[PDB]
Design an enzyme around this catalytic site. Sequence first.
Site, PDB file in Angstrom:
ATOM      1  N   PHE A  13      13.295  21.423  69.516  1.00  0.00           N
ATOM      2  CA  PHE A  13      12.985  22.600  69.555  1.00  0.00           C
ATOM      3  C   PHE A  13      13.992  23.318  68.504  1.00  0.00           C
ATOM      4  O   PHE A  13      13.488  24.350  67.869  1.00  0.00           O
ATOM      5  CB  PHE A  13      12.909  23.440  70.939  1.00  0.00           C
ATOM      6  CG  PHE A  13      11.633  23.180  71.640  1.00  0.00           C
ATOM      7  CD1 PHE A  13      10.309  23.315  70.921  1.00  0.00           C
ATOM      8  CD2 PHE A  13      11.745  22.551  72.955  1.00  0.00           C
ATOM      9  CE1 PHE A  13       9.206  23.152  71.750  1.00  0.00           C
ATOM     10  CE2 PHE A  13      10.492  22.493  73.567  1.00  0.00           C
ATOM     11  CZ  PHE A  13       9.176  22.554  73.062  1.00  0.00           C
ATOM     12  N   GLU A  52      25.604  29.288  80.076  1.00  0.00           N
ATOM     13  CA  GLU A  52      24.618  28.237  80.146  1.00  0.00           C
ATOM     14  C   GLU A  52      24.664  27.774  81.432  1.00  0.00           C
ATOM     15  O   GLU A  52      25.936  27.236  81.788  1.00  0.00           O
ATOM     16  CB  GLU A  52      24.910  27.289  78.889  1.00  0.00           C
ATOM     17  CG  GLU A  52      23.970  25.972  78.906  1.00  0.00           C
ATOM     18  CD  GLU A  52      22.679  26.446  79.034  1.00  0.00           C
ATOM     19  OE1 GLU A  52      21.990  27.312  78.177  1.00  0.00           O
ATOM     20  OE2 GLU A  52      21.786  25.643  80.088  1.00  0.00           O
ATOM     21  N   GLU A 105      16.992  33.712  74.577  1.00  0.00           N
ATOM     22  CA  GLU A 105      15.526  33.154  74.616  1.00  0.00           C
ATOM     23  C   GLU A 105      15.243  32.355  75.770  1.00  0.00           C
ATOM     24  O   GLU A 105      15.468  31.152  75.883  1.00  0.00           O
ATOM     25  CB  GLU A 105      15.196  32.543  73.253  1.00  0.00           C
ATOM     26  CG  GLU A 105      15.246  30.956  73.054  1.00  0.00           C
ATOM     27  CD  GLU A 105      13.643  30.607  73.730  1.00  0.00           C
ATOM     28  OE1 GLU A 105      13.393  29.441  73.141  1.00  0.00           O
ATOM     29  OE2 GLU A 105      13.031  31.370  74.630  1.00  0.00           O
ATOM     30  N   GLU A 114       8.921  31.972  82.653  1.00  0.00           N
ATOM     31  CA  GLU A 114      10.236  31.100  82.984  1.00  0.00           C
ATOM     32  C   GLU A 114      11.455  32.152  83.614  1.00  0.00           C
ATOM     33  O   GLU A 114      12.610  31.762  83.593  1.00  0.00           O
ATOM     34  CB  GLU A 114      10.790  30.375  81.601  1.00  0.00           C
ATOM     35  CG  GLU A 114      10.043  29.421  81.262  1.00  0.00           C
ATOM     36  CD  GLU A 114      10.684  28.365  80.110  1.00  0.00           C
ATOM     37  OE1 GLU A 114      11.856  28.693  79.625  1.00  0.00           O
ATOM     38  OE2 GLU A 114       9.805  27.633  79.565  1.00  0.00           O
TER      39      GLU A 114
HETATM   40  O1  LIG Z   1       5.168  25.674  74.715  1.00  0.00           O
HETATM   41  C1  LIG Z   1       5.838  24.763  74.987  1.00  0.00           C
HETATM   42  N1  LIG Z   1       6.670  24.816  75.972  1.00  0.00           N
HETATM   43  C2  LIG Z   1       7.008  26.062  76.496  1.00  0.00           C
HETATM   44  C3  LIG Z   1       8.480  25.986  76.394  1.00  0.00           C
HETATM   45  O2  LIG Z   1       9.008  27.211  77.238  1.00  0.00           O
HETATM   46  C4  LIG Z   1       8.863  25.952  74.906  1.00  0.00           C
HETATM   47  N2  LIG Z   1      10.249  26.605  74.634  1.00  0.00           N
HETATM   48  C5  LIG Z   1      10.573  26.777  73.113  1.00  0.00           C
HETATM   49  C6  LIG Z   1      11.746  27.153  72.961  1.00  0.00           C
HETATM   50  C7  LIG Z   1      12.724  26.151  73.690  1.00  0.00           C
HETATM   51  C8  LIG Z   1      14.044  26.236  73.343  1.00  0.00           C
HETATM   52  C9  LIG Z   1      15.029  25.429  73.704  1.00  0.00           C
HETATM   53  C10 LIG Z   1      14.788  24.724  74.961  1.00  0.00           C
HETATM   54  C11 LIG Z   1      13.207  24.597  75.493  1.00  0.00           C
HETATM   55  C12 LIG Z   1      12.408  25.699  74.828  1.00  0.00           C
HETATM   56  C13 LIG Z   1      11.140  25.555  75.271  1.00  0.00           C
HETATM   57  C14 LIG Z   1       5.775  23.464  74.210  1.00  0.00           C
HETATM   58  C15 LIG Z   1       5.963  22.280  74.593  1.00  0.00           C
HETATM   59  C16 LIG Z   1       5.981  20.904  74.246  1.00  0.00           C
HETATM   60  C17 LIG Z   1       5.523  21.052  72.839  1.00  0.00           C
HETATM   61  C18 LIG Z   1       5.242  22.287  71.969  1.00  0.00           C
HETATM   62  N3  LIG Z   1       5.297  22.491  70.822  1.00  0.00           N
HETATM   63  C19 LIG Z   1       5.661  21.436  69.746  1.00  0.00           C
HETATM   64  C20 LIG Z   1       4.825  21.234  68.568  1.00  0.00           C
HETATM   65  C21 LIG Z   1       5.305  20.727  67.276  1.00  0.00           C
HETATM   66  O3  LIG Z   1       6.095  19.531  67.405  1.00  0.00           O
HETATM   67  C22 LIG Z   1       7.230  19.694  68.801  1.00  0.00           C
HETATM   68  C23 LIG Z   1       6.637  20.235  70.049  1.00  0.00           C
HETATM   69  C24 LIG Z   1       5.475  23.332  72.741  1.00  0.00           C
HETATM   70  N1  LIG Z   2      19.799  32.050  84.739  1.00  0.00           N
HETATM   71  C1  LIG Z   2      20.353  31.310  83.794  1.00  0.00           C
HETATM   72  N2  LIG Z   2      21.504  31.339  83.573  1.00  0.00           N
HETATM   73  C2  LIG Z   2      22.204  30.540  82.376  1.00  0.00           C
HETATM   74  N3  LIG Z   2      21.337  29.680  81.564  1.00  0.00           N
HETATM   75  C3  LIG Z   2      20.027  29.733  81.796  1.00  0.00           C
HETATM   76  C4  LIG Z   2      19.488  30.554  82.929  1.00  0.00           C
HETATM   77  N4  LIG Z   2      18.257  30.436  82.845  1.00  0.00           N
HETATM   78  C5  LIG Z   2      18.015  29.462  81.653  1.00  0.00           C
HETATM   79  N5  LIG Z   2      18.973  29.296  80.890  1.00  0.00           N
HETATM   80  C6  LIG Z   2      19.509  28.214  79.858  1.00  0.00           C
HETATM   81  O1  LIG Z   2      18.678  28.944  78.811  1.00  0.00           O
HETATM   82  C7  LIG Z   2      18.120  28.117  77.717  1.00  0.00           C
HETATM   83  C8  LIG Z   2      16.997  28.583  77.217  1.00  0.00           C
HETATM   84  C9  LIG Z   2      16.470  27.839  75.947  1.00  0.00           C
HETATM   85  N6  LIG Z   2      15.132  28.394  75.682  1.00  0.00           N
HETATM   86  C10 LIG Z   2      17.378  28.394  74.884  1.00  0.00           C
HETATM   87  C11 LIG Z   2      18.078  27.124  74.242  1.00  0.00           C
HETATM   88  C12 LIG Z   2      18.748  27.405  73.077  1.00  0.00           C
HETATM   89  N7  LIG Z   2      19.514  29.075  73.083  1.00  0.00           N
HETATM   90  C13 LIG Z   2      18.061  27.490  71.864  1.00  0.00           C
HETATM   91  O2  LIG Z   2      17.208  28.373  71.451  1.00  0.00           O
HETATM   92  O3  LIG Z   2      17.937  26.187  71.424  1.00  0.00           O
HETATM   93  C14 LIG Z   2      18.447  26.717  78.632  1.00  0.00           C
HETATM   94  O4  LIG Z   2      19.414  25.984  78.203  1.00  0.00           O
HETATM   95  C15 LIG Z   2      18.420  26.975  79.924  1.00  0.00           C
HETATM   96  O5  LIG Z   2      19.224  26.046  80.625  1.00  0.00           O
END
Ligand SMILES: O=C(NC[C@H](O)CN1CCc2ccccc2C1)c1cccc(NC2CCOCC2)c1
Ligand SMILES: Nc1ncnc2c1ncn2[C@@H]1O[C@H](C[C@@H](N)CC[C@H](N)C(=O)O)[C@@H](O)[C@H]1O
EC number: 2.1.1.320
Lengths: 322, 322, 313, 303
Positions: free
Chosen positions: B12, B77, B120, B129
């Site tokens: 991601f 985190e 995010e 989430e």
């Molecule tokens: O929408 C999806 N998952 C819901 C999650 O909340 C997506 N976010 C996305 C933002 C994010 C950032 C850091 C760590 C986790 C997450 C998870 C999802 C799950 C698996 C795959 C994908 N899409 C892409 C398509 C292009 O290739 C890589 C996987 C999307």
């Molecule tokens: N209540 C919470 N307190 C601290 N961290 C959290 C909590 N809930 C979710 N997280 C962390 O927030 C992150 C959410 C991700 N989508 C963001 C990851 C990173 N900032 C990125 O954009 O690549 C994950 O690493 C979670 O483990």
Amino acid sequence: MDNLESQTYEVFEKDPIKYSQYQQAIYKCLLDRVPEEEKDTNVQVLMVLGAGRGPLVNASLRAAKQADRRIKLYAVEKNPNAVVTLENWQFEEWGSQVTVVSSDMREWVAPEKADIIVSELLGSFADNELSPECLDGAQHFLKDDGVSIPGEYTSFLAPISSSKLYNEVRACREKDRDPEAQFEMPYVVRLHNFHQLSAPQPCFTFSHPNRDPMIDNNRYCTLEFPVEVNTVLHGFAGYFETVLYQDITLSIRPETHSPGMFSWFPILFPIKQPITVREGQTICVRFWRCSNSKKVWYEWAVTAPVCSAIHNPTGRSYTIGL
Amino acid sequence: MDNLESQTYEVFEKDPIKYSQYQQAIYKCLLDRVPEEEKDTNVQVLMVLGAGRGPLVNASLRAAKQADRRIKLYAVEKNPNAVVTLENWQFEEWGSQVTVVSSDMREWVAPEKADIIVSELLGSFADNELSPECLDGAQHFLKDDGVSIPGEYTSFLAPISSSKLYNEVRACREKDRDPEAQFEMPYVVRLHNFHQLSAPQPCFTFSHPNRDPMIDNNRYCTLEFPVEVNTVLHGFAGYFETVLYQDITLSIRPETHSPGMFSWFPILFPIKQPITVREGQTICVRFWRCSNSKKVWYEWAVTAPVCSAIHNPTGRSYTIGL
Amino acid sequence: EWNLPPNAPACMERQLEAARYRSDGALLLGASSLSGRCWAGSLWLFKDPCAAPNEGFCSAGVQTEAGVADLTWVGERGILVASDSGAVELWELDENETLIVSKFCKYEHDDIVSTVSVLSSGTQAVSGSKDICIKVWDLAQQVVLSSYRAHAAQVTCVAASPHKDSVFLSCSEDNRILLWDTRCPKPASQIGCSAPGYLPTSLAWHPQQSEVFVFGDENGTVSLVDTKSTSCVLSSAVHSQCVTGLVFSPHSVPFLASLSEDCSLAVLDSSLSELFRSQAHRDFVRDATWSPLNHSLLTTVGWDHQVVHHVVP
Amino acid sequence: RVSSGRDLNCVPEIADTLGAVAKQGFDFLCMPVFHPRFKREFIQEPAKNRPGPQTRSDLLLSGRDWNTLIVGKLSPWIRPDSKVEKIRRNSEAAMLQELNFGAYLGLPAFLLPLNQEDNTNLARVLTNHIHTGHHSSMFWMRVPLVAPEDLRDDIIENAPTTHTEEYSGEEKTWMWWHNFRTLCDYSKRIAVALEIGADLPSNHVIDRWLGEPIKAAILPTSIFLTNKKGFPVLSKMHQRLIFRLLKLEVQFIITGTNHHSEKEFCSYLQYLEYLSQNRPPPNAYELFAKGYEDYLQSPLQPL
Ligand SMILES: O=C(NC[C@H](O)CN1CCc2ccccc2C1)c1cccc(NC2CCOCC2)c1
Ligand SMILES: Nc1ncnc2c1ncn2[C@@H]1O[C@H](C[C@@H](N)CC[C@H](N)C(=O)O)[C@@H](O)[C@H]1O
Ligand SMILES: O=C(NC[C@H](O)CN1CCc2ccccc2C1)c1cccc(NC2CCOCC2)c1
Ligand SMILES: Nc1ncnc2c1ncn2[C@@H]1O[C@H](C[C@@H](N)CC[C@H](N)C(=O)O)[C@@H](O)[C@H]1O
């Protein structure tokens, strides 16, 4: 997570021993705390935690007019349905000597600290209704020299043989869940058609208040039971003992059972598979008390004369909600 | 309740839009907050909440050296495994401009209040989430004039027809659970072989910070979808929109989709039984967001042109742990 | 408790439902017991208005059978009561006014009687109930003359016009405000700004035009209606909860009192602007009454068991 | 002989009231659990913090008397499907509260009205309740044969009652209940308490509740006619209904005040007994097929 029904309180309130024993505990404690010359100068503040329909409250009133001493009462109770009975009692009868609080004791912000807290939050295996956690969450409002009633409780285990009960647990398979979950949770049961293979032994103990630097309610304990007959193990009967105050106690351990007290049956911890035991051998079993922020559970295994599966790993088959 | 794996972050992190969009959001906000003459006198304190392997942190550093302004960083985190990466980055590269905190944001006792918080914590249905709950639990350490990024997000729903997907959900029956649980939880899915029966409509909205007197994240909403073709309803695609800062946004709503952003697929809400819909009719559906202290869940029904069972009553088939 | 004179009950139930000044200057009180063992009600007269709700410093008192949902003065010694029992009852004050006696108690409604109002002549009254019926009474005869199932849900409020003995306004949870006029073959007429607003919860005729009235809704809005125009003249978001009552002052250009379940009182002018507001109550505010003797005095009662006298600028 | 209860919405003393009605002949009581007028607040201060007790004490009757004699009623102010958000929220909380209270008391049944088209949220709160804790209580829905709106006197000059027929419009009420128990996913714990009116609807729409889980029929006092000797009776058609309903072994429920002061409530009840006594008598088959009704057997492997 759930609320006791009116009829449940009704039935248990009729215990002929649990109540007089508590009255006697508060009585002894009051004296030990306010000396004869101080009797009208000192009003002890007493908090009942989990006050139900109020019998412990009444029994406190009865204790004070027996010690001939003076007390301020709080009646804290989580069940809003019972809190209704309480609030009716206090308007019709008790008066403002009793302050009724409708909240959780882990949650209540207490207007003042207590001389003595009082609770009966125990289950047949002593700490299986999370009385540790509740009294721990409440103790910050107990005076630095404050008494808890009860002061301590201790669980026990004895191995048993019973095909009858092994078959009843088996019969507890439900659709839509692990076909072996029946086996991984403790049953409150009046043990009848069974054999007790070894004398009960203490398992888990908790003291209150917990002057523990950093508090931990989790536990792991190992027990060895001498077996002097051939047989088949189908599970463990749990029982408990508790000290209310000093020598005043209650017990469901058979060797010290409180005469006429019907308020608790024993508990049963089953095992997925029955285990043969030769005359002469030792049964080693093990129990863990486990927890996270949301729930507390037990997990257990037999390690001798053979091993069983570790039962209930993760609280997957049963937990108690926090 | 669970922790993201290293490879998940890895995949991601490669998004070509989510990151530059955040950089641009912090950039705009910094300027609007420290005027040209104040630039060296004013050091904005910036907290990244859920810092993962640190890309939002870097992007903040990139924002400040673009606004030519000065910032103090915290990287909070919960995942201790990611917190390892972070703590390595900060010793090898970032220096003490970044303070890495290994805890939950609902839990952290912040040494100082923040100018801007940043997170995010969003899922394909915006608030699935528990970003509401997390940012609500963290906001007590945001300055009274403090910005949140993001500022708001909004969920959406559109009804769809797809036998293909209806059959995939069906295929998700597992042993040892309700034979219809498959149907009562939302699936993240790349929607392909499907028909969209009506234009998406907004569902749930949350703003941050929540200057709400007494805060409530629960919701109930009713939607009416005009249908102008004959067909069979098999469920609802959810999508979302969010405002990071002012005009800088991200979206998976098809009509406003962010070009090249692959970070979120849409969500699917199935229904236990498919429902015939005549050309001309209106689909009324209803969604509730529900919660207790331990978990948050959705529950939903169709009320027109016929009723369905209320789905997921009690979070019996699925909840998200708090 | 100076004497609590003969026939008055020992204690007065917590939930104060109504308060009405007599032209005389005395204060009539209605009270329900809405929780605890006994679900009853009581009636009180307080010639010393400053001495209420204190039981011993009262002129007369009496236990009613069931709770009192509403009431009103009849002339000068009459007290007309809307019961939980489904009864409308009339109590008539003692000749010395130290005793309060049953006159009639008629069980004519099938459910709680919730609203009651006295018609201009003073010989007749109209009541409203949860049974969805509206009834017209001959007070002298002790009978129901007319019965009306106009509404489709429980009746919230009925109110006789100041001067016309056959015109009264009613409102119900079926979202209708009805202008009545028993002189017509079809008595009711549906008045409102237009199609569905929020549910109407309270009504008061203007004491100066049999042509104009205010209504209050469940959303906290008070609005001003002209029957002569049938369009919504003016409105204002006065409350954060239901508006349970509206009471015009005796002033020539009168003020409007406005009570609510948000536990607050408001006083409004001609154009519905806020002149005063009181948080004196810490439970629901149930009634308001303007002093006949001092027109800047206003008395309100709530479920907090406070009897409260306001000075109004 | 039939089983029948009284429906009251006013009870000053629970002891005295119960005695009265049982002495009048009734099997059980429909009464409120909290005062019908005692609107409670759950979010906004200060009303939120109103000193208690919220209601009467359980101690006022034996467990047995609760379990067997009292049917609860939902407070009439509880409107979970109000269009006003704040009202909706208090109604949720209040409904839960009155429901958990009935369960705490172990009442055999509890009553809830379907008096409008939309009960989505009432349904969702109730489903939510059914799947929480453990209790066995029955839920009775008060649905009327004829909607209140289609019963109103034609006495609004500028809103007449739309005179000539709608086949669907005489059925709307069954769809209120249909939709309700579909959303609740045919719970077996949710049955019908059908209210009978003065004007029966077209015979078809009476047909409509053929087969449905009717557990009670509510007859208001106001639909009884009066004979040569001032006693209360029913129209010929109203008797057809009773006889049919008797076959379903529903319980009867008298509601509203007495409209014939010339005798006790026991006279209404007396009449009902009279109709049960005088039913088209039980035959050879019907006597035999008695404890077998709606009982499903798998057939045999005959070979
Ligand atoms: O929408 C999806 N998952 C819901 C999650 O909340 C997506 N976010 C996305 C933002 C994010 C950032 C850091 C760590 C986790 C997450 C998870 C999802 C799950 C698996 C795959 C994908 N899409 C892409 C398509 C292009 O290739 C890589 C996987 C999307
Ligand atoms: N209540 C919470 N307190 C601290 N961290 C959290 C909590 N809930 C979710 N997280 C962390 O927030 C992150 C959410 C991700 N989508 C963001 C990851 C990173 N900032 C990125 O954009 O690549 C994950 O690493 C979670 O483990
Ligand atoms: O041990 C039992 N239950 C575990 C519970 O924690 C017992 N305590 C007993 C103390 C108590 C007091 C108030 C409210 C609840 C309770 C529950 C139990 C359960 C059902 C029945 C009984 N035993 C008696 C036997 C004599 O007749 C009444 C039931 C005992
Ligand atoms: N955390 C808690 N806070 C407040 N009350 C609680 C808590 N946990 C349990 N209770 C109440 O404590 C009571 C436990 C009963 N064994 C005692 C009832 C009563 N004192 C009696 O002995 O008859 C129940 O009424 C519970 O609802």
